[PDB]
Structure 1
Amino acid sequence: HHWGYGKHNGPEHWHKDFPIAKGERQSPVDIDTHTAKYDPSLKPLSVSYDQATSLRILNNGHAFNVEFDDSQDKAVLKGGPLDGTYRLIQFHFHWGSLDGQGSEHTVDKKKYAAELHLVHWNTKYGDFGKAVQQPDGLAVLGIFLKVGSAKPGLQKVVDVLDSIKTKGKSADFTNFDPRGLLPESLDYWTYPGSLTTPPLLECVTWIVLKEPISVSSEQVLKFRKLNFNGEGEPEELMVDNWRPAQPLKNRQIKASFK
């Protein structure tokens, strides 16, 4: 047994094993659109996923991760609020049991049906494990999912979920293009924060896109068929795997747009 999202091991318990849960720069947060300062010094985000190499998809018991080859500068995030270059290592999502909840960040208290996280690590620290020990170690791009028209570029991900239903299952997952998960606009808010699962390390520059992607009800339904438990255990549907908003405290949310 370990941390999870249930009544006995969920977000409100995490602090007992990861005391930084109560720290000064925790994620997610509510993005108050009227308090976020437009910052004309922010650069456009640079997302270069042209040469991205997906390798595998994994159910790790808390979400599913699509993993990338990060042994070269093939899929990088640069510009925006960032200095230097961050390599894509994985993406995953957080979603709800119902369309009314599921996102981690909220926007003037609005919850989206899900949220995508494309996780990148600062190439000056050499590997992901070293980056997470650093205040500017990670750059996570957050994208909101709302339910409406399907996202054609998500379908390949939903169709493989049958094969990784339970914890520890993985499947080959090559030639997936993450550029088909982006919305049209790259307007963003940014603030310094943390991993939103344990160990909750305060290593993240969060870059959250203003424009949501639209996904179909059937697509998000297929997320909710996955399982937190392993094969041949009591079936526990993988839903509501989001941490609620944490105290903003001494932080400013900047906007890249007016």
Structure 2
Amino acid sequence: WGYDDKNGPEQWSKLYPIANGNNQSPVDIKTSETKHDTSLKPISVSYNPATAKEIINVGHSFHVNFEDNDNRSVLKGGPFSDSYRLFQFHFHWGSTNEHGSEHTVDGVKYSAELHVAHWNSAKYSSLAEAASKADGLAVIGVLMKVGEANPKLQKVLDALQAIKTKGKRAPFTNFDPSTLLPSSLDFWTYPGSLTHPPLYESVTWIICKESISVSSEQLAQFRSLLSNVEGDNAVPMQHNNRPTQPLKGRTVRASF
């Protein structure tokens, strides 16, 4: 699978029928249809920069992985009674500034999106066990609006020159990804999925109402990452955002 016209989001249903499921992501958050839920606690992140491990070119994107052997790095609060363990973050972006986010708010497309991914370590003993369970994953989504250069993005963007081609990886250490999160953690939450194969309906989405900035040049650095292996013809990673999917009667809740 990929984001080509041949192996792309429109085609994914052929090998992953769950792509047409009832809890697919991302979605368009219509603010007129959200339900304020008084029972939602604030989101609490506490991440240890020593859990930062490795940055990997996975062909369609790049992932920053964290050591997840204990609860040094955790998400709590929001709609959760369980503590969720940080295991990675990544970005989605588009071919132009005009699109690039996965989630949209009242039809508005942002330029990119940050995903900070966590697994239910109160209930399950590994990511591999949790990854397919309804309550297994918690992912913070942060819409990224084109404007001023984001200096917190800096260590991440500086590391891409070492992982230019598919399968390259490099140490990436001493980093707290809570430094990328907006000042306000007022959020929307809905039950949904991974936004690429295998599209498991295992994610409680936490979508921040506040955006973060990214420059046109910072976005170009993402699109300059290559999906080919070293030695082959260079194929830029131009986009990796899935279209929004039908809510099919799910409710998006607002903490605010």
Please classify the TM superposition score into its range, dividing by the shorter chain length. over 0.9
Structure 1 counterpart SS, 2:232: coil
How many residue pairs get aligned? The number is 255
Of residues 35, 38, 44, the one that matches 1:37 is 35
Is residue 2:10 matched to residue 1:17? no
Q: Which runs of 5+ in 2 are unaligned?
A: none
Structure 1 counterpart SS, 2:101: coil
1:104-253 equivalence runs, <5 A: 104-123=102-121, 124-253=123-252
Change (3 A) 1:52 1:37: farther
Structure 2 counterpart SS, 1:125: coil
Q: Partners in 2 of 1:41 and 1:177 — Cα distance?
A: 29
Q: Which residue of 2 aligns with 1:5?
A: 3
**CA deviations over 1:71-119 (Å, ceiling 9, x no partner):** 1101111110112011010000000111111111111111111000000
Structure 1 counterpart SS, 2:219: helix
Q: TM-score, normalised on structure 1?
A: 0.96
**CA displacement at 1:139 relative to structure 2:** 0.2
Q: Which residue of 2 aligns with 1:101?
A: 99
Q: Partners in 2 of 1:89 and 1:157 — Cα distance?
A: 16
Is residue 2:58 matched to residue 1:60? yes
Q: Partners in 2 of 1:16 and 1:68 — Cα distance?
A: 33
**CA displacement at 1:14 relative to structure 2:** 0.4
Amino acid paired to 2:27: V
Q: Which residue of 2 aligns with 1:89?
A: 87
Q: TM-score, normalised on structure 2?
A: 0.97
Amino acid paired to 1:86: Y
Change (3 A) 1:52 1:77: farther
Q: Partners in 2 of 1:54 and 1:42 — Cα distance?
A: 29
Q: Is the 8 A contact 1:154 1:180 kept in 2?
A: no
Q: Is the 8 A contact 2:146 2:214 kept in 1?
A: yes
Q: Is the 8 A contact 1:46 1:77 kept in 2?
A: yes
4+ residue runs of structure 1 moved beyond 3 angstroms? none
Amino acid paired to 1:201: Y
Residue identity (%): 61
Amino acid paired to 1:68: F
Amino acid paired to 1:89: F
Structure 1 counterpart SS, 2:108: coil
Structure 2 counterpart SS, 1:224: helix
Q: Partners in 1 of 2:176 and 2:150 — Cα distance?
A: 13
Q: Which runs of 5+ in 1 are unaligned?
A: none
Q: Partners in 2 of 1:111 and 1:126 — Cα distance?
A: 37
**CA displacement at 1:234 relative to structure 2:** 2.5
